[PDB]
Write a protein that binds this ligand. Structure first.
Ligand SMILES: CC(C)(COP(=O)(O)OP(=O)(O)OC[C@H]1O[C@@H](n2cnc3c(N)ncnc32)[C@H](O)[C@@H]1OP(=O)(O)O)[C@@H](O)C(=O)NCCC(=O)NCCS
Length: 227
């Protein structure tokens, strides 16, 4: 239950919490207030939705937030409790939540991916030329740098959207990577190439994150601090 800790910072760790699961536990019914969000959904969506919301409430509870419904807002963003921020993700074999206190943490974005190739047609749609040239030179050959780049792009959108309420395209952020000498973890910086105007606080120009590959999964997390 600690895979996502591999991408969280020590700077604000006291004001963060996380919860993850690797399958959908039986006997979970949706909260009534949340059931409308999946009323028309296929079973696989209904089950992961319920599991991921379960993780969110577990993590929120660790920070002293009483369990409650988490509704869906502008463009599908989760509606966190007052004073809280967070991000949610699922893929085959992963469901996870990371949350933080807004006094310490301005935004969170996470993503989980299978550590598998992407098709070369999806690569150009999700990358800049500079990323396709640079990431090979910064990442050991054993890693699926196409998939890790994509994971970081998704973490970037999720950290961005709640602060801007604007689209961020695959071509609107240039992501540069570093690999730790261990070769399965590292850091990235997402450089925003468009207007970074936010609803409050300073504009978004650069979002720093972490990445990890373990147990056939990529994880990324961005944790923007309140300054
Ligand atoms: C929205 C998106 C990022 C979700 O990622 P995903 O890999 O499809 O799915 P994940 O399981 O990792 O994430 C899903 C969760 O993201 C969260 N999410 C959805 N829309 C969101 C938004 N606008 N802002 C923040 N979080 C959002 C939700 O909690 C959702 O799960 P829920 O519906 O169960 O609440 C993705 O589907 C998408 O639309 N991407 C396009 C935007 C983009 O990536 N731009 C590139 C920026 S450099």
């Amino acid at each position: 239950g600690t895979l996502v800790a591999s991408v969280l910072p020590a700077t604000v760790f006291e004001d963060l919490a996380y919860a993850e699961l690797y399958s959908d536990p039986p006997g979970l019914t949706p909260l009534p207030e949340e059931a409308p969000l999946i009323a028309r959904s296929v079973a696989k969506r209904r089950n992961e939705f319920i599991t991921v919301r379960h993780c969110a409430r577990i993590a929120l509870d660790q920070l002293g937030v009483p369990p409650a419904p988490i509704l869906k807002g502008d463009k599908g963003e989760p509606c966190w409790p007052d004073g809280m921020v967070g991000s949610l993700t699922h893929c085959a074999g992963y469901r996870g939540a990371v949350v933080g206190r807004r006094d310490a943490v301005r935004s969170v974005g996470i993503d989980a991916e299978p550590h598998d190739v992407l098709p070369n047609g999806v690569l150009d749609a999700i990358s800049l030329p500079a990323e396709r040239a640079d990431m090979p030179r910064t990442m050991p050959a054993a890693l699926h740098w196409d998939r890790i780049l994509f994971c970081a792009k998704e973490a970037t959108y999720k950290a961005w959207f709640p602060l801007t309420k604007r689209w961020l395209g695959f071509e609107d952020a240039h992501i540069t990577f570093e690999t730790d000498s261990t070769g399965w973890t590292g850091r990235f910086v997402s450089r925003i190439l468009i207007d970074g105007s936010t609803l409050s606080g300073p504009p978004l120009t650069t979002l720093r994150g972490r990445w990890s590959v373990e147990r056939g999964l990529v994880l990324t997390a961005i944790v923007l601090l309140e300054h």
